PDB file of N, CA, C and O in Angstrom:
ATOM      1  N   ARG A  11       8.796   3.828  15.194  1.00 32.88           N
ATOM      2  CA  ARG A  11       7.613   2.977  15.113  1.00 32.88           C
ATOM      3  C   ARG A  11       7.104   2.764  13.690  1.00 32.88           C
ATOM      4  O   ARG A  11       6.120   2.057  13.484  1.00 32.88           O
ATOM      5  N   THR A  12       7.770   3.370  12.710  1.00 34.49           N
ATOM      6  CA  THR A  12       7.326   3.261  11.323  1.00 34.49           C
ATOM      7  C   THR A  12       7.831   1.990  10.654  1.00 34.49           C
ATOM      8  O   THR A  12       8.902   1.483  10.977  1.00 34.49           O
ATOM      9  N   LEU A  13       7.043   1.480   9.715  1.00 34.75           N
ATOM     10  CA  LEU A  13       7.408   0.282   8.982  1.00 34.75           C
ATOM     11  C   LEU A  13       7.183   0.504   7.496  1.00 34.75           C
ATOM     12  O   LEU A  13       6.087   0.866   7.072  1.00 34.75           O
ATOM     13  N   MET A  14       8.232   0.300   6.709  1.00 30.97           N
ATOM     14  CA  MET A  14       8.139   0.448   5.265  1.00 30.97           C
ATOM     15  C   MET A  14       7.574  -0.820   4.634  1.00 30.97           C
ATOM     16  O   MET A  14       7.961  -1.927   4.995  1.00 30.97           O
ATOM     17  N   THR A  15       6.643  -0.649   3.702  1.00 31.58           N
ATOM     18  CA  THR A  15       6.080  -1.768   2.957  1.00 31.58           C
ATOM     19  C   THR A  15       5.969  -1.401   1.484  1.00 31.58           C
ATOM     20  O   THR A  15       5.967  -0.222   1.129  1.00 31.58           O
ATOM     21  N   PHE A  16       5.885  -2.411   0.627  1.00 31.73           N
ATOM     22  CA  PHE A  16       5.662  -2.181  -0.796  1.00 31.73           C
ATOM     23  C   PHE A  16       4.255  -2.600  -1.197  1.00 31.73           C
ATOM     24  O   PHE A  16       3.773  -3.656  -0.792  1.00 31.73           O
ATOM     25  N   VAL A  17       3.598  -1.760  -1.989  1.00 31.15           N
ATOM     26  CA  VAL A  17       2.262  -2.054  -2.494  1.00 31.15           C
ATOM     27  C   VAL A  17       2.255  -1.954  -4.016  1.00 31.15           C
ATOM     28  O   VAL A  17       2.537  -0.895  -4.575  1.00 31.15           O
ATOM     29  N   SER A  18       1.936  -3.058  -4.685  1.00 29.37           N
ATOM     30  CA  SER A  18       1.991  -3.107  -6.144  1.00 29.37           C
ATOM     31  C   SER A  18       0.610  -3.113  -6.800  1.00 29.37           C
ATOM     32  O   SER A  18      -0.376  -3.546  -6.203  1.00 29.37           O
ATOM     33  N   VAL A  19       0.558  -2.633  -8.039  1.00 28.97           N
ATOM     34  CA  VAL A  19      -0.677  -2.581  -8.814  1.00 28.97           C
ATOM     35  C   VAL A  19      -0.615  -3.578  -9.974  1.00 28.97           C
ATOM     36  O   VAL A  19       0.426  -3.731 -10.614  1.00 28.97           O
ATOM     37  N   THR A  20      -1.729  -4.256 -10.237  1.00 29.64           N
ATOM     38  CA  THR A  20      -1.777  -5.283 -11.275  1.00 29.64           C
ATOM     39  C   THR A  20      -1.749  -4.693 -12.682  1.00 29.64           C
ATOM     40  O   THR A  20      -1.873  -3.483 -12.866  1.00 29.64           O
ATOM     41  N   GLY A  21      -1.587  -5.567 -13.672  1.00 30.80           N
ATOM     42  CA  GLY A  21      -1.601  -5.164 -15.066  1.00 30.80           C
ATOM     43  C   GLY A  21      -0.404  -4.325 -15.466  1.00 30.80           C
ATOM     44  O   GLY A  21       0.731  -4.636 -15.112  1.00 30.80           O
ATOM     45  N   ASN A  22      -0.663  -3.261 -16.218  1.00 31.57           N
ATOM     46  CA  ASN A  22       0.394  -2.362 -16.666  1.00 31.57           C
ATOM     47  C   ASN A  22      -0.057  -0.907 -16.615  1.00 31.57           C
ATOM     48  O   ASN A  22      -0.144  -0.241 -17.647  1.00 31.57           O
ATOM     49  N   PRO A  23      -0.346  -0.407 -15.406  1.00 33.52           N
ATOM     50  CA  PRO A  23      -0.872   0.947 -15.214  1.00 33.52           C
ATOM     51  C   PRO A  23       0.166   2.012 -15.533  1.00 33.52           C
ATOM     52  O   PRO A  23       1.360   1.718 -15.579  1.00 33.52           O
ATOM     53  N   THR A  24      -0.293   3.237 -15.756  1.00 29.65           N
ATOM     54  CA  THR A  24       0.608   4.373 -15.848  1.00 29.65           C
ATOM     55  C   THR A  24       0.853   4.893 -14.439  1.00 29.65           C
ATOM     56  O   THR A  24       0.085   4.605 -13.521  1.00 29.65           O
ATOM     57  N   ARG A  25       1.924   5.656 -14.263  1.00 31.98           N
ATOM     58  CA  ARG A  25       2.248   6.179 -12.944  1.00 31.98           C
ATOM     59  C   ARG A  25       1.089   6.981 -12.373  1.00 31.98           C
ATOM     60  O   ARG A  25       0.810   6.900 -11.178  1.00 31.98           O
ATOM     61  N   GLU A  26       0.407   7.742 -13.226  1.00 29.04           N
ATOM     62  CA  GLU A  26      -0.723   8.556 -12.787  1.00 29.04           C
ATOM     63  C   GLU A  26      -1.901   7.692 -12.350  1.00 29.04           C
ATOM     64  O   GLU A  26      -2.619   8.044 -11.417  1.00 29.04           O
ATOM     65  N   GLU A  27      -2.098   6.565 -13.031  1.00 26.75           N
ATOM     66  CA  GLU A  27      -3.166   5.638 -12.668  1.00 26.75           C
ATOM     67  C   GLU A  27      -2.887   4.992 -11.315  1.00 26.75           C
ATOM     68  O   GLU A  27      -3.731   5.021 -10.421  1.00 26.75           O
ATOM     69  N   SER A  28      -1.702   4.405 -11.177  1.00 28.02           N
ATOM     70  CA  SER A  28      -1.296   3.789  -9.919  1.00 28.02           C
ATOM     71  C   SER A  28      -1.313   4.804  -8.782  1.00 28.02           C
ATOM     72  O   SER A  28      -1.659   4.473  -7.649  1.00 28.02           O
ATOM     73  N   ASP A  29      -0.944   6.041  -9.096  1.00 30.89           N
ATOM     74  CA  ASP A  29      -0.941   7.112  -8.108  1.00 30.89           C
ATOM     75  C   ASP A  29      -2.348   7.333  -7.563  1.00 30.89           C
ATOM     76  O   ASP A  29      -2.549   7.430  -6.354  1.00 30.89           O
ATOM     77  N   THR A  30      -3.321   7.403  -8.465  1.00 29.88           N
ATOM     78  CA  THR A  30      -4.712   7.605  -8.074  1.00 29.88           C
ATOM     79  C   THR A  30      -5.262   6.377  -7.353  1.00 29.88           C
ATOM     80  O   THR A  30      -5.977   6.493  -6.360  1.00 29.88           O
ATOM     81  N   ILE A  31      -4.917   5.198  -7.858  1.00 29.36           N
ATOM     82  CA  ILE A  31      -5.379   3.949  -7.268  1.00 29.36           C
ATOM     83  C   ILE A  31      -4.823   3.733  -5.859  1.00 29.36           C
ATOM     84  O   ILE A  31      -5.580   3.493  -4.916  1.00 29.36           O
ATOM     85  N   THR A  32      -3.505   3.831  -5.711  1.00 25.17           N
ATOM     86  CA  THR A  32      -2.879   3.628  -4.406  1.00 25.17           C
ATOM     87  C   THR A  32      -3.292   4.706  -3.410  1.00 25.17           C
ATOM     88  O   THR A  32      -3.421   4.439  -2.216  1.00 25.17           O
ATOM     89  N   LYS A  33      -3.506   5.923  -3.902  1.00 27.31           N
ATOM     90  CA  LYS A  33      -3.950   7.005  -3.029  1.00 27.31           C
ATOM     91  C   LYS A  33      -5.345   6.695  -2.517  1.00 27.31           C
ATOM     92  O   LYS A  33      -5.709   7.053  -1.399  1.00 27.31           O
ATOM     93  N   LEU A  34      -6.125   6.021  -3.353  1.00 25.93           N
ATOM     94  CA  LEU A  34      -7.457   5.580  -2.971  1.00 25.93           C
ATOM     95  C   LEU A  34      -7.360   4.672  -1.746  1.00 25.93           C
ATOM     96  O   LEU A  34      -8.045   4.881  -0.745  1.00 25.93           O
ATOM     97  N   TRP A  35      -6.492   3.668  -1.831  1.00 24.59           N
ATOM     98  CA  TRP A  35      -6.284   2.739  -0.725  1.00 24.59           C
ATOM     99  C   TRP A  35      -5.712   3.454   0.496  1.00 24.59           C
ATOM    100  O   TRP A  35      -6.108   3.181   1.629  1.00 24.59           O
ATOM    101  N   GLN A  36      -4.784   4.374   0.257  1.00 24.80           N
ATOM    102  CA  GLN A  36      -4.178   5.139   1.339  1.00 24.80           C
ATOM    103  C   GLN A  36      -5.226   5.946   2.099  1.00 24.80           C
ATOM    104  O   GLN A  36      -5.188   6.032   3.325  1.00 24.80           O
ATOM    105  N   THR A  37      -6.158   6.534   1.357  1.00 25.95           N
ATOM    106  CA  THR A  37      -7.231   7.325   1.947  1.00 25.95           C
ATOM    107  C   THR A  37      -8.184   6.444   2.748  1.00 25.95           C
ATOM    108  O   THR A  37      -8.587   6.791   3.857  1.00 25.95           O
ATOM    109  N   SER A  38      -8.548   5.306   2.173  1.00 23.99           N
ATOM    110  CA  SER A  38      -9.397   4.347   2.862  1.00 23.99           C
ATOM    111  C   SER A  38      -8.772   3.957   4.201  1.00 23.99           C
ATOM    112  O   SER A  38      -9.443   3.946   5.232  1.00 23.99           O
ATOM    113  N   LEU A  39      -7.481   3.643   4.176  1.00 23.94           N
ATOM    114  CA  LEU A  39      -6.751   3.290   5.387  1.00 23.94           C
ATOM    115  C   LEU A  39      -6.716   4.453   6.371  1.00 23.94           C
ATOM    116  O   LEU A  39      -6.896   4.268   7.575  1.00 23.94           O
ATOM    117  N   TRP A  40      -6.488   5.653   5.850  1.00 22.56           N
ATOM    118  CA  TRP A  40      -6.416   6.846   6.683  1.00 22.56           C
ATOM    119  C   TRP A  40      -7.735   7.085   7.408  1.00 22.56           C
ATOM    120  O   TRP A  40      -7.750   7.476   8.575  1.00 22.56           O
ATOM    121  N   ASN A  41      -8.839   6.849   6.708  1.00 24.27           N
ATOM    122  CA  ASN A  41     -10.166   7.050   7.282  1.00 24.27           C
ATOM    123  C   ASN A  41     -10.583   5.910   8.207  1.00 24.27           C
ATOM    124  O   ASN A  41     -11.646   5.954   8.826  1.00 24.27           O
ATOM    125  N   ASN A  42      -9.738   4.888   8.289  1.00 22.17           N
ATOM    126  CA  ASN A  42      -9.933   3.802   9.240  1.00 22.17           C
ATOM    127  C   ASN A  42      -8.837   3.812  10.302  1.00 22.17           C
ATOM    128  O   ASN A  42      -8.575   2.802  10.959  1.00 22.17           O
ATOM    129  N   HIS A  43      -8.198   4.968  10.451  1.00 23.63           N
ATOM    130  CA  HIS A  43      -7.215   5.194  11.509  1.00 23.63           C
ATOM    131  C   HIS A  43      -5.878   4.476  11.303  1.00 23.63           C
ATOM    132  O   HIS A  43      -5.134   4.253  12.257  1.00 23.63           O
ATOM    133  N   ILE A  44      -5.575   4.120  10.060  1.00 26.01           N
ATOM    134  CA  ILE A  44      -4.267   3.566   9.724  1.00 26.01           C
ATOM    135  C   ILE A  44      -3.538   4.530   8.795  1.00 26.01           C
ATOM    136  O   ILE A  44      -3.761   4.530   7.585  1.00 26.01           O
ATOM    137  N   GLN A  45      -2.673   5.357   9.374  1.00 25.02           N
ATOM    138  CA  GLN A  45      -1.998   6.412   8.626  1.00 25.02           C
ATOM    139  C   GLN A  45      -0.674   5.952   8.027  1.00 25.02           C
ATOM    140  O   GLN A  45       0.181   5.404   8.724  1.00 25.02           O
ATOM    141  N   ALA A  46      -0.511   6.193   6.732  1.00 23.97           N
ATOM    142  CA  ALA A  46       0.718   5.850   6.033  1.00 23.97           C
ATOM    143  C   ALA A  46       1.117   6.960   5.067  1.00 23.97           C
ATOM    144  O   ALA A  46       0.264   7.660   4.525  1.00 23.97           O
ATOM    145  N   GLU A  47       2.421   7.124   4.871  1.00 23.28           N
ATOM    146  CA  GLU A  47       2.934   7.979   3.814  1.00 23.28           C
ATOM    147  C   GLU A  47       3.078   7.115   2.575  1.00 23.28           C
ATOM    148  O   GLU A  47       3.365   5.926   2.680  1.00 23.28           O
ATOM    149  N   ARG A  48       2.879   7.707   1.403  1.00 22.15           N
ATOM    150  CA  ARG A  48       2.877   6.944   0.158  1.00 22.15           C
ATOM    151  C   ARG A  48       3.844   7.536  -0.868  1.00 22.15           C
ATOM    152  O   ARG A  48       3.821   8.736  -1.128  1.00 22.15           O
ATOM    153  N   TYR A  49       4.688   6.687  -1.449  1.00 24.20           N
ATOM    154  CA  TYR A  49       5.649   7.128  -2.457  1.00 24.20           C
ATOM    155  C   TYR A  49       5.707   6.161  -3.628  1.00 24.20           C
ATOM    156  O   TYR A  49       5.921   4.966  -3.442  1.00 24.20           O
ATOM    157  N   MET A  50       5.527   6.683  -4.837  1.00 19.96           N
ATOM    158  CA  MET A  50       5.688   5.877  -6.038  1.00 19.96           C
ATOM    159  C   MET A  50       7.171   5.623  -6.288  1.00 19.96           C
ATOM    160  O   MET A  50       7.985   6.545  -6.239  1.00 19.96           O
ATOM    161  N   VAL A  51       7.517   4.368  -6.552  1.00 20.12           N
ATOM    162  CA  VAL A  51       8.901   4.005  -6.838  1.00 20.12           C
ATOM    163  C   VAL A  51       9.003   3.294  -8.181  1.00 20.12           C
ATOM    164  O   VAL A  51      10.096   3.049  -8.690  1.00 20.12           O
ATOM    165  N   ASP A  52       7.847   2.957  -8.741  1.00 20.02           N
ATOM    166  CA  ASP A  52       7.758   2.397 -10.082  1.00 20.02           C
ATOM    167  C   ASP A  52       6.408   2.816 -10.640  1.00 20.02           C
ATOM    168  O   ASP A  52       5.607   3.424  -9.932  1.00 20.02           O
ATOM    169  N   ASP A  53       6.154   2.500 -11.905  1.00 16.14           N
ATOM    170  CA  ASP A  53       4.877   2.841 -12.518  1.00 16.14           C
ATOM    171  C   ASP A  53       3.729   2.054 -11.891  1.00 16.14           C
ATOM    172  O   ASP A  53       2.577   2.487 -11.923  1.00 16.14           O
ATOM    173  N   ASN A  54       4.052   0.901 -11.311  1.00 16.34           N
ATOM    174  CA  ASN A  54       3.039   0.036 -10.718  1.00 16.34           C
ATOM    175  C   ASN A  54       3.342  -0.343  -9.270  1.00 16.34           C
ATOM    176  O   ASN A  54       2.805  -1.323  -8.760  1.00 16.34           O
ATOM    177  N   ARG A  55       4.204   0.420  -8.608  1.00 18.90           N
ATOM    178  CA  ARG A  55       4.573   0.095  -7.236  1.00 18.90           C
ATOM    179  C   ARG A  55       4.766   1.327  -6.363  1.00 18.90           C
ATOM    180  O   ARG A  55       5.353   2.322  -6.779  1.00 18.90           O
ATOM    181  N   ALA A  56       4.259   1.251  -5.141  1.00 18.66           N
ATOM    182  CA  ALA A  56       4.395   2.346  -4.198  1.00 18.66           C
ATOM    183  C   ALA A  56       4.965   1.859  -2.879  1.00 18.66           C
ATOM    184  O   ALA A  56       4.842   0.687  -2.528  1.00 18.66           O
ATOM    185  N   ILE A  57       5.599   2.774  -2.160  1.00 16.45           N
ATOM    186  CA  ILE A  57       5.984   2.528  -0.786  1.00 16.45           C
ATOM    187  C   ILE A  57       4.892   3.058   0.121  1.00 16.45           C
ATOM    188  O   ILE A  57       4.550   4.236   0.072  1.00 16.45           O
ATOM    189  N   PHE A  58       4.328   2.175   0.933  1.00 13.95           N
ATOM    190  CA  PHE A  58       3.446   2.595   2.008  1.00 13.95           C
ATOM    191  C   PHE A  58       4.244   2.575   3.304  1.00 13.95           C
ATOM    192  O   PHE A  58       4.605   1.510   3.806  1.00 13.95           O
ATOM    193  N   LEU A  59       4.538   3.759   3.827  1.00 14.83           N
ATOM    194  CA  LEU A  59       5.313   3.885   5.054  1.00 14.83           C
ATOM    195  C   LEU A  59       4.383   4.139   6.232  1.00 14.83           C
ATOM    196  O   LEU A  59       3.950   5.267   6.465  1.00 14.83           O
ATOM    197  N   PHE A  60       4.073   3.081   6.972  1.00 14.80           N
ATOM    198  CA  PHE A  60       3.122   3.175   8.074  1.00 14.80           C
ATOM    199  C   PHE A  60       3.713   3.857   9.303  1.00 14.80           C
ATOM    200  O   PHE A  60       4.748   3.436   9.821  1.00 14.80           O
ATOM    201  N   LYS A  61       3.046   4.913   9.762  1.00 18.36           N
ATOM    202  CA  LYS A  61       3.481   5.641  10.949  1.00 18.36           C
ATOM    203  C   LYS A  61       3.513   4.717  12.162  1.00 18.36           C
ATOM    204  O   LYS A  61       4.384   4.838  13.023  1.00 18.36           O
ATOM    205  N   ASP A  62       2.553   3.799  12.223  1.00 18.14           N
ATOM    206  CA  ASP A  62       2.500   2.807  13.292  1.00 18.14           C
ATOM    207  C   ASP A  62       2.631   1.404  12.706  1.00 18.14           C
ATOM    208  O   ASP A  62       1.645   0.806  12.273  1.00 18.14           O
ATOM    209  N   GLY A  63       3.857   0.889  12.694  1.00 20.14           N
ATOM    210  CA  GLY A  63       4.161  -0.393  12.083  1.00 20.14           C
ATOM    211  C   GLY A  63       3.313  -1.562  12.554  1.00 20.14           C
ATOM    212  O   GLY A  63       3.169  -2.556  11.838  1.00 20.14           O
ATOM    213  N   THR A  64       2.749  -1.455  13.752  1.00 18.26           N
ATOM    214  CA  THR A  64       1.916  -2.529  14.287  1.00 18.26           C
ATOM    215  C   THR A  64       0.621  -2.681  13.492  1.00 18.26           C
ATOM    216  O   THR A  64      -0.119  -3.648  13.676  1.00 18.26           O
ATOM    217  N   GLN A  65       0.358  -1.729  12.601  1.00 19.16           N
ATOM    218  CA  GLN A  65      -0.865  -1.738  11.800  1.00 19.16           C
ATOM    219  C   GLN A  65      -0.624  -2.258  10.386  1.00 19.16           C
ATOM    220  O   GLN A  65      -1.567  -2.437   9.616  1.00 19.16           O
ATOM    221  N   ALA A  66       0.642  -2.493  10.055  1.00 22.47           N
ATOM    222  CA  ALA A  66       1.034  -2.862   8.696  1.00 22.47           C
ATOM    223  C   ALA A  66       0.325  -4.105   8.161  1.00 22.47           C
ATOM    224  O   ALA A  66      -0.106  -4.130   7.006  1.00 22.47           O
ATOM    225  N   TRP A  67       0.211  -5.136   8.993  1.00 22.26           N
ATOM    226  CA  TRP A  67      -0.368  -6.400   8.544  1.00 22.26           C
ATOM    227  C   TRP A  67      -1.889  -6.329   8.409  1.00 22.26           C
ATOM    228  O   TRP A  67      -2.468  -6.949   7.514  1.00 22.26           O
ATOM    229  N   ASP A  68      -2.528  -5.574   9.295  1.00 21.81           N
ATOM    230  CA  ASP A  68      -3.964  -5.340   9.193  1.00 21.81           C
ATOM    231  C   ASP A  68      -4.256  -4.540   7.928  1.00 21.81           C
ATOM    232  O   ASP A  68      -5.245  -4.785   7.238  1.00 21.81           O
ATOM    233  N   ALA A  69      -3.379  -3.589   7.623  1.00 18.86           N
ATOM    234  CA  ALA A  69      -3.506  -2.797   6.405  1.00 18.86           C
ATOM    235  C   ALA A  69      -3.349  -3.694   5.185  1.00 18.86           C
ATOM    236  O   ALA A  69      -4.101  -3.588   4.214  1.00 18.86           O
ATOM    237  N   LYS A  70      -2.368  -4.587   5.251  1.00 18.86           N
ATOM    238  CA  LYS A  70      -2.117  -5.540   4.179  1.00 18.86           C
ATOM    239  C   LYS A  70      -3.344  -6.411   3.910  1.00 18.86           C
ATOM    240  O   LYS A  70      -3.700  -6.648   2.757  1.00 18.86           O
ATOM    241  N   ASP A  71      -3.990  -6.877   4.978  1.00 16.54           N
ATOM    242  CA  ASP A  71      -5.174  -7.727   4.853  1.00 16.54           C
ATOM    243  C   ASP A  71      -6.279  -7.046   4.047  1.00 16.54           C
ATOM    244  O   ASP A  71      -7.011  -7.703   3.307  1.00 16.54           O
ATOM    245  N   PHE A  72      -6.393  -5.731   4.204  1.00 13.74           N
ATOM    246  CA  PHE A  72      -7.355  -4.938   3.446  1.00 13.74           C
ATOM    247  C   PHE A  72      -6.884  -4.704   2.012  1.00 13.74           C
ATOM    248  O   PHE A  72      -7.649  -4.864   1.062  1.00 13.74           O
ATOM    249  N   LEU A  73      -5.617  -4.327   1.867  1.00 18.96           N
ATOM    250  CA  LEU A  73      -5.045  -4.003   0.564  1.00 18.96           C
ATOM    251  C   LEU A  73      -5.147  -5.147  -0.443  1.00 18.96           C
ATOM    252  O   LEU A  73      -5.552  -4.937  -1.586  1.00 18.96           O
ATOM    253  N   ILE A  74      -4.777  -6.353  -0.019  1.00 17.55           N
ATOM    254  CA  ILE A  74      -4.728  -7.496  -0.929  1.00 17.55           C
ATOM    255  C   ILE A  74      -6.108  -7.952  -1.398  1.00 17.55           C
ATOM    256  O   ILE A  74      -6.222  -8.755  -2.327  1.00 17.55           O
ATOM    257  N   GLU A  75      -7.155  -7.435  -0.762  1.00 17.42           N
ATOM    258  CA  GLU A  75      -8.520  -7.767  -1.159  1.00 17.42           C
ATOM    259  C   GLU A  75      -9.093  -6.740  -2.131  1.00 17.42           C
ATOM    260  O   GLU A  75     -10.223  -6.879  -2.597  1.00 17.42           O
ATOM    261  N   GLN A  76      -8.309  -5.708  -2.433  1.00 13.06           N
ATOM    262  CA  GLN A  76      -8.773  -4.630  -3.300  1.00 13.06           C
ATOM    263  C   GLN A  76      -8.503  -4.911  -4.773  1.00 13.06           C
ATOM    264  O   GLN A  76      -7.478  -5.493  -5.129  1.00 13.06           O
ATOM    265  N   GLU A  77      -9.434  -4.491  -5.624  1.00 16.05           N
ATOM    266  CA  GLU A  77      -9.286  -4.631  -7.068  1.00 16.05           C
ATOM    267  C   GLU A  77      -8.038  -3.892  -7.547  1.00 16.05           C
ATOM    268  O   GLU A  77      -7.861  -2.711  -7.255  1.00 16.05           O
ATOM    269  N   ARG A  78      -7.178  -4.606  -8.269  1.00 16.85           N
ATOM    270  CA  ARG A  78      -5.957  -4.046  -8.854  1.00 16.85           C
ATOM    271  C   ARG A  78      -4.738  -4.097  -7.928  1.00 16.85           C
ATOM    272  O   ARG A  78      -3.659  -3.633  -8.298  1.00 16.85           O
ATOM    273  N   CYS A  79      -4.899  -4.657  -6.731  1.00 15.62           N
ATOM    274  CA  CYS A  79      -3.754  -4.819  -5.838  1.00 15.62           C
ATOM    275  C   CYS A  79      -3.004  -6.109  -6.132  1.00 15.62           C
ATOM    276  O   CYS A  79      -3.484  -7.203  -5.835  1.00 15.62           O
ATOM    277  N   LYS A  80      -1.818  -5.968  -6.715  1.00 13.84           N
ATOM    278  CA  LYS A  80      -0.988  -7.106  -7.085  1.00 13.84           C
ATOM    279  C   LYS A  80      -0.459  -7.841  -5.857  1.00 13.84           C
ATOM    280  O   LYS A  80      -0.266  -9.055  -5.886  1.00 13.84           O
ATOM    281  N   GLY A  81      -0.228  -7.099  -4.781  1.00  9.86           N
ATOM    282  CA  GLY A  81       0.257  -7.689  -3.548  1.00  9.86           C
ATOM    283  C   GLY A  81       0.916  -6.676  -2.633  1.00  9.86           C
ATOM    284  O   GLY A  81       1.097  -5.515  -3.000  1.00  9.86           O
ATOM    285  N   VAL A  82       1.269  -7.122  -1.433  1.00  6.71           N
ATOM    286  CA  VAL A  82       1.936  -6.270  -0.460  1.00  6.71           C
ATOM    287  C   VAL A  82       3.175  -6.976   0.077  1.00  6.71           C
ATOM    288  O   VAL A  82       3.158  -8.183   0.306  1.00  6.71           O
ATOM    289  N   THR A  83       4.251  -6.220   0.268  1.00  8.45           N
ATOM    290  CA  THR A  83       5.480  -6.772   0.823  1.00  8.45           C
ATOM    291  C   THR A  83       5.782  -6.162   2.187  1.00  8.45           C
ATOM    292  O   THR A  83       5.862  -4.941   2.333  1.00  8.45           O
ATOM    293  N   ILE A  84       5.938  -7.024   3.185  1.00 10.80           N
ATOM    294  CA  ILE A  84       6.283  -6.588   4.530  1.00 10.80           C
ATOM    295  C   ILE A  84       7.417  -7.441   5.074  1.00 10.80           C
ATOM    296  O   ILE A  84       7.317  -8.667   5.111  1.00 10.80           O
ATOM    297  N   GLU A  85       8.496  -6.788   5.489  1.00 14.59           N
ATOM    298  CA  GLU A  85       9.630  -7.479   6.092  1.00 14.59           C
ATOM    299  C   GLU A  85      10.091  -8.655   5.235  1.00 14.59           C
ATOM    300  O   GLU A  85      10.282  -9.763   5.737  1.00 14.59           O
ATOM    301  N   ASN A  86      10.250  -8.405   3.939  1.00 15.60           N
ATOM    302  CA  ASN A  86      10.772  -9.403   3.007  1.00 15.60           C
ATOM    303  C   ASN A  86       9.816 -10.564   2.741  1.00 15.60           C
ATOM    304  O   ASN A  86      10.171 -11.525   2.059  1.00 15.60           O
ATOM    305  N   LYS A  87       8.604 -10.472   3.277  1.00 16.95           N
ATOM    306  CA  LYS A  87       7.582 -11.476   3.016  1.00 16.95           C
ATOM    307  C   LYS A  87       6.507 -10.898   2.105  1.00 16.95           C
ATOM    308  O   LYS A  87       5.953  -9.834   2.379  1.00 16.95           O
ATOM    309  N   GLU A  88       6.214 -11.602   1.019  1.00 15.25           N
ATOM    310  CA  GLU A  88       5.227 -11.126   0.059  1.00 15.25           C
ATOM    311  C   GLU A  88       3.850 -11.738   0.276  1.00 15.25           C
ATOM    312  O   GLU A  88       3.716 -12.923   0.581  1.00 15.25           O
ATOM    313  N   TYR A  89       2.825 -10.906   0.134  1.00 14.23           N
ATOM    314  CA  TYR A  89       1.449 -11.352   0.286  1.00 14.23           C
ATOM    315  C   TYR A  89       0.686 -11.043  -0.993  1.00 14.23           C
ATOM    316  O   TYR A  89       0.224  -9.920  -1.186  1.00 14.23           O
ATOM    317  N   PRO A  90       0.559 -12.042  -1.879  1.00 15.87           N
ATOM    318  CA  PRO A  90      -0.078 -11.848  -3.187  1.00 15.87           C
ATOM    319  C   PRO A  90      -1.546 -11.460  -3.067  1.00 15.87           C
ATOM    320  O   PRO A  90      -2.236 -11.923  -2.160  1.00 15.87           O
ATOM    321  N   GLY A  91      -2.011 -10.615  -3.981  1.00 14.65           N
ATOM    322  CA  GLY A  91      -3.409 -10.232  -4.026  1.00 14.65           C
ATOM    323  C   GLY A  91      -4.168 -11.045  -5.057  1.00 14.65           C
ATOM    324  O   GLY A  91      -3.581 -11.856  -5.776  1.00 14.65           O
TER     325      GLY A  91
END
């Protein structure tokens, strides 16, 4: 039931910055009952692995409205922030 997605950060953050920023979004989602595992794969990009893939797009809708969110990728479709 899990769905892998990509979540990118704008500008040119350091890995530690993006880590703190994306974890912020991950926590917000977690506290709204959308649980995901998070993995940095670039200095400005993370994998959000949603335990319940049916929540991926609702999560995306929130993510792309956040300051510093470059965009979200789901199933080869990109959603710019």
